[PDB]
Amino acid sequence: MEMEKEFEQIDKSGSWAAIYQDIRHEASDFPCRVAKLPKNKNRNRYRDVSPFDHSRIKLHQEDNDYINASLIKMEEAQRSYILTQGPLPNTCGHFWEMVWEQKSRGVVMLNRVMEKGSLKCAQYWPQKEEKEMIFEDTNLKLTLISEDIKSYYTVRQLELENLTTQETREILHFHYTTWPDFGVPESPASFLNFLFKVRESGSLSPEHGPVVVHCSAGIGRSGTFCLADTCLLLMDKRKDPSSVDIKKVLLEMRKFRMGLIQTADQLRFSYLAVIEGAKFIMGDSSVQDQWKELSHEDL
CATH no. for residue 86? 3.90.190.10
Distance CA 279, CA 276 (A): 6
Query: Which residues fall in the annotated binding site for substrate?
Result: 181, 215-221, 262
Q: Which residues have CB under 8 Å from 237's CB, separation 6+?
A: 76, 77
| CA–CA dist 117, 99 (Å, integer) | 29
152-161 long-range Cβ contacts below 8 angstroms, 24+ apart: 152/176, 152/177, 152/178, 152/190, 152/194, 152/295, 152/297, 153/177, 153/178, 153/190, 153/194, 153/197, 153/297, 155/197, 156/125, 158/125, 158/126, 160/96, 160/99, 160/100
Distance CA 175, CA 144 (A): 14
Residue type, 272: L
Q: Which domain holds residue 30?
A: 1-299
Q: Is 218 left (phi over 0), alpha (psi -120 to 50) or beta?
A: left
Facing residues of 141 across strands? 134, 161
Binding site feature residues: 181, 215-221, 262
User: At what angle are helices 246-253 and 16-26 packed, to 10 degrees?
Assistant: 40
Selected catalytic residue, list 32, 121, 215, 226:
215
Residue 268 in contact with residue 262, Cβ under 8 Å? no
Distances (CA, A) of 127 to 87, 97, 132, 202, 296: 16, 20, 8, 24, 24
C-alpha dihedral (178, 180, 184, 187), degrees to nearest 10: -50
Q: What is the DSSP letter of 256?
A: T
121 is catalytic: no
H or E element, residue 205: none
DSSP assignment letter at 208: S
The structural domain count of the chain equals 1
At 39 the three-state DSSP class reads helix
Distance CA 8, CA 4 (A): 6
The answer to whether 57 and 82 are in contact (CB under 8 A) is: yes
Resolution (angstroms) equals: 1.9
